[PDB]
Amino acid sequence: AILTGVPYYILPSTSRAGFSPDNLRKNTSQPSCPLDLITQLRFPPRIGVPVIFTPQNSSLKVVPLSHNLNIHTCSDLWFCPESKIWTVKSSSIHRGLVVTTGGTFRSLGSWFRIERHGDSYKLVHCPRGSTPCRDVGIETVGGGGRRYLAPRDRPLAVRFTRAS
Amino acid sequence: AILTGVPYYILPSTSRAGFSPDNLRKNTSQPSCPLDLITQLRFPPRIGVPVIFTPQNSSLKVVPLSHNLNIHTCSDLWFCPESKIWTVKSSSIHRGLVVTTGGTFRSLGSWFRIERHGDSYKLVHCPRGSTPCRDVGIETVGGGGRRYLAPRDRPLAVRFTRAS
Amino acid sequence: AILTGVPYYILPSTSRAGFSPDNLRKNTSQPSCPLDLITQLRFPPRIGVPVIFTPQNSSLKVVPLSHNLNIHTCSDLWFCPESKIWTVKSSSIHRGLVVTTGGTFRSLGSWFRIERHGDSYKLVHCPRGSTPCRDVGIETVGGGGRRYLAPRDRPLAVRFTRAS
Amino acid sequence: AILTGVPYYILPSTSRAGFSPDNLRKNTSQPSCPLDLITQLRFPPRIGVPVIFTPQNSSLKVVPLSHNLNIHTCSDLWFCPESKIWTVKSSSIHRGLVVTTGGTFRSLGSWFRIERHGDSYKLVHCPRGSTPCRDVGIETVGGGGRRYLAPRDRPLAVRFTRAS
Ligand SMILES: *[C@@H]1O[C@H](CO)[C@@H](O[C@@H]2O[C@H](CO)[C@@H](O)[C@H](O)[C@H]2NC(C)=O)[C@H](O[C@@H]2O[C@@H](C)[C@@H](O)[C@@H](O)[C@@H]2O)[C@H]1NC(C)=O
Ligand SMILES: *[C@@H]1O[C@H](CO)[C@@H](O[C@@H]2O[C@H](CO)[C@@H](O)[C@H](O)[C@H]2NC(C)=O)[C@H](O[C@@H]2O[C@@H](C)[C@@H](O)[C@@H](O)[C@@H]2O)[C@H]1NC(C)=O
Ligand SMILES: *[C@@H]1O[C@H](CO)[C@@H](O)[C@H](O)[C@H]1NC(C)=O
Ligand SMILES: *[C@@H]1O[C@H](CO)[C@@H](O)[C@H](O)[C@H]1NC(C)=O
Ligand SMILES: *[C@@H]1O[C@H](CO)[C@@H](O)[C@H](O)[C@H]1NC(C)=O
Ligand SMILES: *[C@@H]1O[C@H](CO)[C@@H](O)[C@H](O)[C@H]1NC(C)=O
Ligand SMILES: *[C@@H]1O[C@H](CO)[C@@H](O)[C@H](O)[C@H]1NC(C)=O
Ligand SMILES: *[C@@H]1O[C@H](CO)[C@@H](O)[C@H](O)[C@H]1NC(C)=O
């Protein structure tokens, strides 16, 4: 059971290489962050930075699977003027959509879902909060060597583990 | 994509409780199986027994959506004299149509289709291989406590996991 | 130093999920194997089946990096009539090139190279034994849930470890 | 792809011995650095010190091949009064052209290009930002035992690793 409002790390189902907003990797003040990607921490594999899920249905203590929710990074340090809230933006250099921070709670572009996938989970992003949704996977194109979460063809199988 | 000929578990989109033909659940020799239902494994949830999809178009290597196919259970054990092939039968002791094994390849009553259902899928059954097709859902009436697949008004949203 | 004629396991740089020719996964006699893929062993991660490198330059005891070589599976069991030797074939369902067994030593399509990539290695496949080469990576398209090695855009970072 | 502004190690395509400006290798304050060479770290092999690429076209987010760019060392320590920017100087004590730091952004002598070299890459230097460009290779003459980058007839095949 995934709990509303409680911090979890998102990890690949088969690795301990977690994820962080880019601004937190760089760890310095930024004038702005027009495209703050969520990148994988790989050398060495590190747990990353937690997130919190907020179901569209405000009344729910347990996060429903396959239902609209918001995602935001849980971090007391933050080096962007923009929000911690996840969204999706278009990018030329990454040749399409990428997950980024700097969103807005309950906006049209803010909606993701957690869905079962094999014996674990996938994230999907749902434009306008409805189908058709797009799986969230790993991309490298335009990443210059790093891996970043993006709406993809192939979902990243993930699991959630409670933070600290 | 679902590949023709390859075994997949059928699973509810939000659950880990999969499905087995009753005869395999009982695991004992049967004199006949006039109504071998596909029952859900719930206590505890278990992935069940895989199936294989065979499109009506035998050229097809990838199973298409919204086209006639057969389904059969993938199991080396089999405790009924009848086949592993899925079909639909009427049962007054279940007040209506039920999914069962014991069908025949390419027969009038053997045709199902996989369709999109929101962010995932559903199975429908197509009498004589034509529309109207009816959604396959979960029933309980006359299951002696067990839940089993049956054509009904509301579909069961499902996902597919390649076996393993 | 990678030694000519000596068996190694190819592993991803950051996982213990190795690789096997499909025919060895199935472990039964096949009438033929028109497209025997090299698939990753993931549930649970397993070391896989070794390979042997044979440099184009027959005189060499140490495998040269960035030079033409052949690859063949090292296995006393074999369930295909075709060879253990790696090559690349076109596939419709996988939407392009895939690595397969069933090749021929020193043929035009038999040539791969091991090249340094970050702190480890990549495999590339070199049509006709010359540039331009294509990185070998992981693909899923048309794999029905499995991952298979294919000429790709993005290389799989790999390491080699001596077998048993 | 190499991204403008992002740090990468330059590494020989088949080796782990990378490169550092001499002043960083010595790690001691210098009164001037008339010829701060880029020397290879060999005993043992070490990845060295990253550089950043800046295309002459400042619009460009991805570094293109065969176009004028500047290179500079990425280091917070710096022991020369001169800059981190790469250039080429004549040195009669090295019998000819050598790569050095201490250049100036966008100057006549500051232009290098990344070109394809077989299955990998090479750096060339372009006097006045035009052809003919000369290959950058490794020399040793007058290096007091050390190997250093220098324009020459034979290129050093290189690869690039994003820093880390
Ligand atoms: C379900 O029914 C099967 C009946 O065919 C069982 O297989 C049989 O198991 C016997 C006792 O272990 C064995 O003497 C028989 O040879 C075998 N019959 C066949 C055709 O294989 C099966 O038992 C399981 O599998 C066997 C091979 C052992 O591993 C047992 O420990 C298992 O219980 C029955 N399975 C279950 C889970 O009840
Ligand atoms: C290379 O030169 C640097 C000279 O600036 C060294 O940094 C200096 O290290 C001193 C002794 O540790 C320290 O008191 C100084 O504050 C510091 N200077 C500056 C500007 O940072 C450096 O020494 C290494 O780094 C320091 C911070 C410590 O970690 C030492 O243990 C290191 O040796 C010299 N580095 C090497 C590898 O020689
Ligand atoms: C990162 O940034 C914060 C705030 O600027 C600083 O206090 C902290 O020490 C930094 N370094 C590391 C290694 O976390
Ligand atoms: C929230 O969820 C409950 C139970 O699933 C439901 O009864 C209620 O109507 C939902 N509220 C909204 C606003 O969707
Ligand atoms: C069956 O599928 C093949 C491959 O897509 C197609 O070309 C062929 O026309 C189809 N046959 C029928 C009867 O629909
Ligand atoms: C696989 O196949 C071989 C030869 O047919 C057989 O002898 C072996 O026991 C098989 N099973 C396993 C689990 O390796
Ligand atoms: C094999 O390699 C050696 C050293 O690299 C070389 O001298 C020799 O000419 C090579 N032979 C062939 C046939 O390429
Ligand atoms: C620089 O690159 C941009 C983006 O590709 C291009 O559109 C522009 O025309 C280029 N400018 C010059 C001077 O080449």
Author numbering:
A (entry chain B), B (entry chain A), C (entry chain B), D (entry chain A): 1 to 164
Paper text:
The fold of CrataBL consists of a β-trefoil, typical for this protein family. To conclude, the sequence and three-dimensional structure of CrataBL show extensive similarity to protease inhibitors of the Kunitz-type, although the inhibitory activity is weak (in the micromolar range). A number of its biological properties have been characterized, including delay in clot formation by impairing the intrinsic pathway of coagulation cascade. In addition, CrataBL was shown to exhibit anti-inflammatory, analgesic, insecticidal, and anti-tumor activities.
The three-dimensional structure of CrataBL was determined in two crystal forms. Both of them were in space group C2 and contained two molecules in the asymmetric unit, but the unit cell parameters and crystal packing were different. Further analysis of glycosylation by mass spectrometry and protein sequence determination has shown the presence of N-linked oligosaccharides at Asn27 and Asn57. However, it is not clear whether the dimer observed in both crystal forms of CrataBL is biologically significant. There is no particular need for dimerization of a protease inhibitor, since Kunitz-P type inhibitors form 1∶1 complexes with their target enzymes. Since we were not able to obtain crystals of CrataBL with a target protease such as trypsin, the location of the reactive loop may only be predicted. However, the observation that CrataBL is slowly cleaved by trypsin between serines 58 and 59, located on a loop that is involved in direct interaction with the active site residues in trypsin and other serine proteases, lends credence to this assumption. Thus the detailed structural basis of the inhibition mode by CrataBL still needs to be verified.
